[PDB]
Amino acid sequence: HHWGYGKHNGPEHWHKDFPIAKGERQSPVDIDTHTAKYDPSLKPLSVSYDQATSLRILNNGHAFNVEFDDSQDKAVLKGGPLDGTYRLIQFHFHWGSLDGQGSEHTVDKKKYAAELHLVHWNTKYGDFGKAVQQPDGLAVLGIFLKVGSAKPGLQKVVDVLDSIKTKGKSADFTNFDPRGLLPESLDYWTYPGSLTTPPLLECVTWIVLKEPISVSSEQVLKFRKLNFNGEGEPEELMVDNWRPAQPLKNRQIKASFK
Ligand SMILES: [Co+2]
């Protein structure tokens, strides 16, 4: 019926409705650190989020998105392996039912507790919808979360979750600064890939940060309290909303560092 992460509609069944699931440039992948090639020609990433305008938070039934105003060049990503400017449209997470799983990308087969995705679209395409039809339409920054110390900058997000518990709920969410979610180092890995949920379009340049951020157990615990279901439907906790690693095929992972 419609896709999800359960036994009957989970990642292993997505190919029936979205044949691109068995495509040549699917994500996520396992990052083999000894095989990634250092590329001295990659430029440092440039993150300009000081003018970011958040608008809302929404439970879409598969995760929660914080949405931003992308009508102008307010929060952009450039440099790194990118050509042109990419505007932030939304961020969301993928997490597990336990601390030993949750990330989409793995590092030398290591799974993290969760993974943050900051989604950006190439301004040359004019809107998000046109950008998803192009091989270079999106740029996603992926950041791993491990459990340790609490992340101060994440608390405002944790605290509104109660108000968007079930599918379709939303809440005003203004003045959130996504700079509070970045690790200290911007060193990264990059490879060409796809969105990790249907429609699984291969339009993404992934930028995966080497340094994870830490969150406390209590913070991640609040994520696991969300629901996949709509209000008044039987309760299915929103956990394990991650897709397993896909074959690398004909692709090379490049590193911005050694
Ligand atoms: Co994602």
Return the CA Rg of the chain. Answer: 17
Give the Cα separation of 145 and 111 in Å (integer): 10
Helix or strand run (H / E) with residue 123: none
Question: How far out from the chain centre does Cα 255 lie?
Answer: 19
- The DSSP output letter for 184 is S
9 and 240 Cβ atoms separated by less than 8 Å: no
- CA 26 to centroid of ligand 1, rounded, Å: 13
Cα of 20 from ligand 1 centre, angstroms? 17
**Strands 30-31 vs 76-79: parallel, antiparallel or unpaired:** unpaired
- What are the C-alpha distances in Å from 159 to residues 165, 218, 222, 236, 242? 12, 11, 8, 21, 23
**DSSP secondary structure letter of residue 174:** -
Yes or no: say if 91 and 66 are a contact pair by the CB < 8 Å rule. yes
Torsion of CA 148, 152, 156, 157, to 10 degrees: -30
How far, in Å, from the CA of 122 to the mean position of ligand 1? 17
State in Å: Cα 11 to ligand 1 middle: 14
Locus of tokens 């990264």: 188
Domain that holds residue 21: 1-258
Q: Is the peptide bond before 199 cis (omega within 30 degrees of 0)?
A: yes
How was this structure determined? It was done by: X-ray
Q: Report the b/e string of 22-59 with b at 16+ CB within 10 A.
A: ebebbbbbbbeeeebeeeeebeebebebeebbbbebbb
CB 57 within 8 A of CB 65: yes
According to DSSP, the residues that pair with 122 across neighbouring strands are: 86
Tokens (6 digits) for 77: 């990503």
CB 148 within 8 A of CB 118: no
* Annotated catalytic residue, options 2, 62, 105, 120: 62
d(CA 101, CA 24): 25
Question: For position 215, which CATH number holds?
Answer: 3.10.200.10
CB 228 within 8 A of CB 61: yes
What distance in angstroms lies between residue 100's CA and the mean position of ligand 1's atoms?
18
How far apart CA 162 and CA 27 sit, in angstroms, is 31
**What is the sign of the dihedral through the CA atoms of 161, 195, 152 and 110?**
positive
Resolution in A: 1.9
Rounded CA gap, 109 and 228, in Å?
28
Amino acid, res. 101:
Q
Binding residues for Zn(2+): 92, 94, 117
Length of the chain, please? 258
Domain total in the chain: 1
Judge whether 31 and 189 are in contact, CB under 8 Å: yes
Residue positions forming the annotated binding site for substrate: 196-197
Joined tokens for residue 37: 């090639």
Let me know if 105 is a catalytic residue.
no
